[PDB]
A paper describes a structure:
Deoxyribozymes (DNAzymes) are short (15–40 nt) single-stranded DNA molecules that catalyze chemical reactions. DNAzymes generally consist of two substrate binding arms flanking a central catalytic core. The RNA-cleaving 10-23 DNAzyme was the first DNAzyme to be evolved and possesses clinical and biotechnical applications as a biosensor and a knockdown agent. Despite this, a lack of structural and mechanistic information has hindered the optimization and application of the 10-23 DNAzyme.
To address this need, we have obtained a 2.7 Å crystal structure of the 10-23 DNAzyme-substrate complex captured in precatalytic conditions. To combat the crystallization forces contributing to artifact formation, the substrate and DNAzyme were placed on the same continuous ssDNA strand with a snapback GAAA tetraloop to allow for alignment of the scissile phosphate within the DNAzyme catalytic core. This oligonucleotide contains a single ribonucleotide position (−1A), that uses its 2′-OH as the attacking nucleophile to cleave the adjacent 3′ phosphoribose backbone position. To capture a precatalytic 10-23 DNAzyme structure, the 2′-OH position of the RNA nucleophile was modified by 2′-O-methyl (2′-OMe) substitution which was shown to attenuate activity in vitro. The structure exhibits a homodimer conformation with extensive base pairing occurring throughout the 10-23 DNAzyme catalytic core. The dimer is mediated through two regions of antiparallel base pairing within the catalytic core. The region (G2-C7) is palindromic and is responsible for most of the base pair interactions that occur within the dimer. In this structure of the 10-23 DNAzyme, a bend is observed at the scissile phosphate and is coordinated through base pair interaction with the substrate binding arms at the −1 and +1 positions relative to the catalytic core and with G1 forming a non-canonical G-A base pair with the ribo-adenosine at the cleavage site. The captured precatalytic active site conformation does not align the 2′-OH nucleophile with the scissile phosphate in the pre-requisite in-line attack conformation often observed in RNA-cleaving machines. Two magnesium ions are observed to coordinate to the 2′-OH nucleophile, 3′ bridging oxygen, and the 5′ leaving group of the cleavage site.
Residue numbers in the entry: 0 to 174
Write the structure that this text describes.
DNA sequence: GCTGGGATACATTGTGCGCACAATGGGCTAGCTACAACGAATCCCAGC
């Protein structure tokens, strides 16, 4: 079940060209530019409970179809839970069962979702508390203020990080 | 901090390791086309 960093790196390199989903009988490949490593893996953590992947979906309707009909070529896996935005799989890798999580994020919300899925839980809690003090709500979908999305002139996770007012930290040192 | 996915009340079993969830069983009760029907609200796990 447990796996080291290089093990999960090999798993992501294997899966980067083997992700797809069934869309009304059509097998759709998931491009590697949309597969982003996240979670404890994006941090150079020595040991991994799981491998966390963020798939980027260009259109909104297809969000229903990616994870519920997710497919992997040539790999055995079980599904414990699966919905529109989150899915966990028990993949079989060399006679060991591994946990592999998939999360979806629209392209408009790429920096936010990446940010929410990269940093450690505690770092996220501290950031969201600091933003909430100023009447703001930050999540994987955007910045909100009085139950209203706040537009930001940003495109990457780093531009988000500075536009929001905190010091940038590469994923490793975030804590 | 903020969200996602899967059951939704109350007593009785099989596990692979005194345990814990999916799966039975039965008095109690609302309402009666001897029908049968939403979908938020809620809670408990899960993710970072
Ligand atoms: Mg993980
Ligand atoms: Mg109960
Ligand atoms: Na999806
Ligand atoms: Na997401
Ligand atoms: Na708001
Ligand atoms: Na504003
Ligand atoms: Na910081
Ligand atoms: Na009747
Ligand atoms: Na009848």
């Amino acid at each position: 079940s447990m796996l080291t960093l290089i093990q999960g790196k090999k798993i992501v390199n294997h899966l980067r060209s083997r992700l797809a989903f069934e869309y009304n009988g059509q097998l759709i490949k998931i491009l590697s530019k949309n597969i982003v490593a996240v979670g404890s893996l994006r941090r150079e953590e020595k040991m991994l409970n799981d491998v966390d992947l963020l798939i980027i979906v260009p259109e909104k309707k297809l969000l229903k179809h990616v994870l519920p009909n997710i497919r992997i070529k040539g790999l055995s896996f079980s599904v414990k839970v699966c919905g529109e935005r989150k899915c966990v799989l028990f993949i079989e890798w060399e006679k060991k069962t591994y946990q592999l999580d998939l999360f979806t994020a629209l392209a408009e919300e790429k920096p936010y979702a990446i940010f929410h899925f990269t940093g450690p839980v505690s770092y996220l809690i501290r950031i969201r508390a600091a933003l909430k003090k100023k009447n703001y709500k930050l999540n994987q979908y955007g910045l909100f203020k009085n139950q209203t999305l706040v537009p930001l002139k940003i495109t990457t996770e780093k531009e988000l990080i500075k536009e929001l007012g905190f010091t940038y930290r590469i994923p490793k040192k975030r804590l």
